[PDB]
Amino acid sequence: PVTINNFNYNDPIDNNNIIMMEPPFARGTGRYYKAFKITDRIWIIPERYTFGYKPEDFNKSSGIFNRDVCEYYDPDYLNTNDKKNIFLQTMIKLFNRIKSKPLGEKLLEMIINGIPYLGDRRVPLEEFNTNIASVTVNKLISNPGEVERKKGIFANLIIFGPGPVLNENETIDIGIQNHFASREGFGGIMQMKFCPEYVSVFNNVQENKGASIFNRRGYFSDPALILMHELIHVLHGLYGIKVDDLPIVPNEKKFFMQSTDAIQAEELYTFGGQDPSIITPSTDKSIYDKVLQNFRGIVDRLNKVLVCISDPNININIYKNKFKDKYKFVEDSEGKYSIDVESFDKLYKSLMFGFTETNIAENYKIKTRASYFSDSLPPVKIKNLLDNEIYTIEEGFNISDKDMEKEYRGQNKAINKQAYEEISKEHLAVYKIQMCKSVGICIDVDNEDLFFIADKNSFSDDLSKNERIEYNTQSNYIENDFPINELILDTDLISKIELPSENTESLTDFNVDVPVYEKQPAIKKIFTDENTIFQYLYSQTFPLDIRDISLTSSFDDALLFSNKVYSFFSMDYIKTANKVVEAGLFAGWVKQIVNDFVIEANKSNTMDKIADISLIVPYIGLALNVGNETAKGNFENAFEIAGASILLEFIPELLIPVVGAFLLESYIDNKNKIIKTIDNALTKRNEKWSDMYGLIVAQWLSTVNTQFYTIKEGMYKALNYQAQALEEIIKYRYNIYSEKEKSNINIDFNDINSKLNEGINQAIDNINNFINGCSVSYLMKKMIPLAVEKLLDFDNTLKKNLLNYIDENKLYLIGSAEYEKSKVNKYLKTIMPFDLSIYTNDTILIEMFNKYNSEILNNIILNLRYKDNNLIDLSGYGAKVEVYDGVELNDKNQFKLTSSANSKIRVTQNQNIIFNSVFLDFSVSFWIRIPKYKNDGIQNYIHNEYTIINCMKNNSGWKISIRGNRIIWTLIDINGKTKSVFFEYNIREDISEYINRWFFVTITNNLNNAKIYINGKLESNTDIKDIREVIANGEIIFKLDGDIDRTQFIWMKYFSIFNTELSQSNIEERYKIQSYSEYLKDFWGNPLMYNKEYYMFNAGNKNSYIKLKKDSPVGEILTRSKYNQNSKYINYRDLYIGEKFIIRRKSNSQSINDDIVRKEDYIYLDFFNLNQEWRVYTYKYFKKEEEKLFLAPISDSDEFYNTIQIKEYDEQPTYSCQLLFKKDEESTDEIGLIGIHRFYESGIVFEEYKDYFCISKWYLKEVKRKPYNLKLGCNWQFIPKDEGWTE
Ligand SMILES: [Ca+2]
Ligand SMILES: [Ca+2]
Ligand SMILES: [Zn+2]
């Protein structure tokens, strides 16, 4: 257990627990400090830490000590005895809170028992030397006013009050002659400057501070955790493992990069959480090796220590026993000490990954910041930690009794205001970057607001070094994890070995290095004419002395005029916000503009499924103009083209080393050693893949995810500035009114702000999901593949290396050189899949990753789309696409392959995507339009198979071919085995739903089957279990290849590939998504057009057509003529028959050239009666359910309706459309729909039934039924002449 002593500042000096100490940095001169022993080996000195600081620096100035901290200055803190006593009682309370739980008590016990070794690097191996500044510190015994008598004492930790900056707590170690005992295995007296009252503040991005913008946001820290964070550094220093290694250094070559001190891995380990992931496995092992090496030195010393010359009274055995337990060394029955690898591993991991701020916060239910790399806010002052109504030892601020245990409400600034006070900004100093334009307007930007981007030098290149493989050689993995539960329940973690007495000989050698600190300018002026995130956010603010503003979409005007504020919301939102109205209409207006704000913010949930993008926040570019000029042009378009990369302010140069070669050790005659060597080389190869992935994650987290964090914060600020601007306008407009008018204006300012905040929170959630998806996207598509390339290259080089090794050792292996030759082939075959959870256990990160992987659209490894008269891959993996001259492209994403040699597309796929191995798992989807057979060429049509898409590599791969009315999918494994699955449509149907008409194809492959889906429906299945390895990432050639007629061609659209098997459900959805359009289609599936001749088809009367009756103004319905020749293979009904209709637009006298017909458009349905253009009419006064349509010349009669509204009542994909007659555009008076009706005719000579072109009200209710009745007589399709259909 740990005992926390009690005492008051004014208690008498007793030379035991209350002394006059000579601090280490005093060099044995100057005054002494009244120090109090709060626990064994731990002292508290309630005074300011002045070592290395100028007295005037305690005053707030125009300078700062740290570039990344909102520094609070207060020279009077601790300037009175009573203040000193309050500090003591507070420290006592924090220590009690700390030991209030096993984990904290153990942290304290480890620290108390982790006494520094008696000596350092300069001390001979055979000696203990207590006469050094890192081991002994002096206390003055003699009477006041005379240093005549002093005594020495051993100590582990001395905690002082704060230095100039109150909120800048720090743990300092003792360096002597340029070296640090605490960094070389020995350990040394540790010091700390700490302040319990002025604590840090933080707010989570992915969260919300009570979801109240207009209110105080963020959470304040629990000083006990802040203290335990420093105690962890102390712990590392005491055990001499606070080593220095390759640090994370921020890139600072650009004006938008955040400047900060180099960050050592020990700092990141101390914080825990995701931060250890920023330290590559390479550096993790480097640091581990240095510590182990340090411990080897100490263990050697224990085996050689013979005497303590500095203190004759030191009991050698007592200390050897203590140090043995401190470092967990083992000793044989003779007393010989050695390192036990298992115990060292557990101690090391406990100290580096067990005791972390993150782990401790979780255990104590204390909320803290998500990461070391998170924006720092201004600190707040805790009113009274000594008041149990505000802070207790058991629960800190989160007192369940005050209903503040849940959701850390006790630390919430918006909720627990009685616990703290804001700090006077006058006493705060903040490092700012002044961005001046070459003229000159300047904008100040806090350093914290810039992008933190780790420089390439931050990462180790150890992977490029060679490795010797031997029968010995084993793997090396350091899990940045330690089960906190075993630590808390560990029986031998805490020492039970006697703690040596603290009294010793007074120190006489005061040699020590004393740090010297100095402030630097708080403002750094730079020049740039760029208008990026900082300028854009700035343009959204207004001075405090201005109260009348107006919104504007003009960024430039907003910068120029102080009464102009920039807005990235709609033109309409902006106009309404600037609208001035009468008092009686103000409440109405407030409701309107506020509602508009919510709508605008909610556009953050915009979908873009047709472009294969589920979520897109359209206004991000306009809001920040971050990255590559995202404020210009259409952001959504730019994103579809370049993806996540366009939002990055800077594209990092990644460190991706060529993996070093393996040197296999020769073992002539030894069969086992040789075989073991081979195995060890294989496993070692896996360590390389994993380490490479770890190197990638580290860079992603510190160079890319940091940039996206800045963007998320930027959007939070942007949205808030917008709400604030609207709030400013509303207040102004309201206050222009007189008191009398205001009394009659029904406005609730708190409901308004509530409405706004809610809209903002909803927006922020969408933006968070959007950005995280972008960040993961960049990792998976722009980083991992470049590592895979090097790793694959490594595998190859290693492959020949091993086989050649099994070669030179063929004899010594005998009848086995074959068994292990295949062993090598199959091993270097299956590659390591990337799993983020292996490199971090951070919930937020893991969830981001899993979400990404649960989105089928991220499985797209090829997506050919039209852009600027060219086809390019938008999957994000950068496939090279060569479209040759003979291919015809249009902006409808349709491309045509002809019989010409130059009608071809060459696609070179990305070779670094896990596509192959395990069992063949991928899908291919595309739309296709295949022309009808030439009647006089039916034999060749059904006989000649021709390839259209071929993808082979080493005579293995896949292809899509066509033989007449059959489309074929063929696989060929590495051995030559071939399997096929096909879809064949009928060519004897009166009306085919496939011939020369656009339809959707989807082929999926799993280890068992090959399936072909047509328009979402499964059509064919083939068992492909026998098929082995199938190389599918070779070049893809789009080209008609075979014995084709020179008239043969093929149209294709939306070609894409997925590296997984699509479900029937995914396919049906893709089908509906790619079928969608605002316009109607024609019979062939192309967009319906105005001013284009069309024959009419009726889905309810397939074999019927309309013809103007010779004797009357009606359309009689006749039977379609048919294929007349004698081929047994074909049959169809003629399509180019009946009247030639043409659709004319009703509105805008923009003439009659041509155009796209959209749903709900009002039209005139006309047709050609010889040299005249006639029209389709409906007599206005019929009382029956239906009537024959009236066909006549163009004219305007009050007796006939002439306007038609083209409709689409079907919710599912179809090329049919419906035609409605309404009383007039505005009314909701429906006359009926155009269809076909059967009439009975009985005349003097003929008796029979005849069908006529009609209008019926009966259809009105029918088109509502679900599922949609495709057989309804009101379903029509327009058929224009097409080269793909000849009759
Ligand atoms: Ca690490
Ligand atoms: Ca302005
Ligand atoms: Zn720290």
CA distance 981 to 1021: 7
- The DSSP bridge partners found for residue 497 are none
Distance 995 CA to ligand 3 centre (A): 72
For tokens 């039934």, the residue is: 1249
CA distance 1114 to 1111: 9
CA distance 245 to 264: 7
CA distance 783 to 697: 9
CA distance 655 to 694: 12
- Residue 1053, helix vs strand vs coil: strand
Region 1089-1279: CATH code: 2.80.10.50
CA distance 350 to 352: 6
Distance 242 CA to ligand 1 centre (A): 16
How determined? X-ray
CA distance 220 to 385: 13
Ligand nearest, relative to CA of residue 536: 2
Tokens of 152: 């020495």
- Residue 883, helix vs strand vs coil: strand
User: At residue 537, what are phi and psi to the nearest 5 degrees?
Assistant: -65, -40
Axis crossing angle, helix 583-602 with helix 705-735, rounded to the nearest 10: 170
Distance 105 CA to ligand 2 centre (A): 56
CA distance 197 to 391: 12
What is the four-CA torsion angle of 503, 508, 511, 514, rounded to 10 degrees? 60
Q: Where are the alpha helices (DSSP H) in 390-465?
A: none
Is 1174 within 8 Å of 1192 (Cβ atoms)? yes
Per-residue DSSP letters for 812-868? HH-TTTTHHHHHHHHHTTSPPPP-GGGT---HHHHHHHHHHHH-GGGGEEEEEEE-S
> Ligand 2 is a single-atom ion; what residues have CB below 5 A from it?
558, 564
Which residues are part of a known binding site for a ganglioside GT1b (d18:1(4E))? 1021, 1185-1186
Which residues are part of a known binding site for D-galactose? 1236-1237
Look up residue 2 and give its DSSP letter: -
Is 564 within 8 Å of 557 (Cβ atoms)? yes
Topology adopted by domain 441-472+529-827: Clostridium botulinum neurotoxin B, "coiled-coil" domain (1.20.1120)
One-letter amino acid at 1014 equals I
The length of the chain in residues reads 1287
Is 115 within 8 Å of 187 (Cβ atoms)? yes
Distance 97 CA to ligand 3 centre (A): 20
CA distance 368 to 713: 18
Distance 238 CA to ligand 1 centre (A): 22
- The DSSP bridge partners found for residue 170 are 193
Domain spanning 843-1075, CATH architecture:
Sandwich (2.60)
Q: How far is CA 101 from CA 110, 111, 413, in A?
A: 14, 16, 26
Maximum Cα–Cα distance across the chain: 147
Neighbour order of strands in the sheet with 945-952 = 880-883, 905-908, 1035-1042, 945-952, 957-963, 966-972, 978-984
CA distance 1021 to 1006: 11
Candidates 1105, 1104, 961; CA nearest to 1040 is 961
Distance 7 CA to ligand 3 centre (A): 29
One-letter amino acid at 523 equals I
CA distance 723 to 757: 8
Axis crossing angle, helix 819-827 with helix 671-699, rounded to the nearest 10: 0
Which residues are part of a known binding site? 229, 233, 267, 1021, 1185-1186, 1236-1237
Candidates 129, 188, 139, 109; CA nearest to 26 is 139
> 1-438 belongs to which CATH class?
alpha beta
Tokens of 1233: 């729909």
Distance 179 CA to ligand 3 centre (A): 21
Ligand nearest, relative to CA of residue 541: 2
Is 218 within 8 Å of 205 (Cβ atoms)? no
What is the four-CA torsion angle of 401, 407, 413, 418, rounded to 10 degrees? 0
Distance 566 CA to ligand 2 centre (A): 7
Ligand nearest, relative to CA of residue 283: 1
What is the four-CA torsion angle of 1006, 1011, 1012, 1013, rounded to 10 degrees? -90
Burial class (CB in 10 A: 0-12, 13-18, 19+), 817: middle
Angle at CA 311, nearest 5°, toward 305 and 317? 40
Distance 263 CA to ligand 3 centre (A): 10
Per-residue DSSP letters for 710-732? HHHHHHHHHHHHHHHHHHHHHHH
Look up residue 350 and give its DSSP letter: I
Is 1264 within 8 Å of 1209 (Cβ atoms)? yes
Q: How far is CA 1181 from CA 741, 1223, 1252, in A?
A: 56, 11, 18
User: At residue 335, what are phi and psi to the nearest 5 degrees?
Assistant: 105, 10
Q: Which residues contact 276 (CB under 8 A, 6 or more apart)?
A: 268, 269, 284, 353, 480, 840
Which residues are part of a known binding site for Zn(2+)? 229, 233, 267
Q: How far is CA 635 from CA 602, 620, 621, in A?
A: 17, 8, 6
CA atoms in the 13 A half-sphere facing the CB of 368? 25
Per-residue DSSP letters for 231-255? HHHHHHHHTT-----SPB-B--SST
Q: How far is CA 593 from CA 542, 588, 729, 768, in A?
A: 20, 9, 11, 25
CA atoms in the 13 A half-sphere facing the CB of 491? 0
Sign of CA dihedral 357, 363, 368, 374: positive
One-letter amino acid at 1085 equals G
- Residue 1084, helix vs strand vs coil: coil
Could you check whether the bond before residue 55 is cis, i.e. omega within 30 degrees of 0?
Answer: no
Tokens of 778: 């960049």
Is 219 within 8 Å of 202 (Cβ atoms)? yes
Residue ranges of domains in the chain? 1-438, 441-472+529-827, 843-1075, 1089-1279
CA distance 624 to 567: 10
Angle at CA 241, nearest 5°, toward 328 and 344? 30
CA distance 911 to 879: 9
CA distance 605 to 591: 22
CA distance 930 to 527: 61
CA distance 9 to 93: 15
Distance 877 CA to ligand 1 centre (A): 28
Q: Which residues contact 1244 (CB under 8 A, 6 or more apart)?
A: none
CA atoms in the 13 A half-sphere facing the CB of 177? 11
Sign of CA dihedral 1267, 1271, 1273, 1278: positive
User: At residue 437, what are phi and psi to the nearest 5 degrees?
Assistant: -90, 155
Look up residue 1261 and give its DSSP letter: H
State the catalytic residues.
Answer: 230
Burial class (CB in 10 A: 0-12, 13-18, 19+), 500: middle
Tokens of 426: 């006058």
Ligand nearest, relative to CA of residue 171: 3
Ligand nearest, relative to CA of residue 542: 2
Ligand nearest, relative to CA of residue 562: 2
Is 247 within 8 Å of 458 (Cβ atoms)? yes
Angle at CA 318, nearest 5°, toward 314 and 324? 125
Per-residue DSSP letters for 307-357? EESS-TT--HHHHHHHHHHHTT-EE-TT--EE--HHHHHHHHHIIIIIS-H
CA distance 100 to 94: 10
Candidates 641, 438, 637, 406; CA nearest to 528 is 438
Tokens of 374: 């998170």
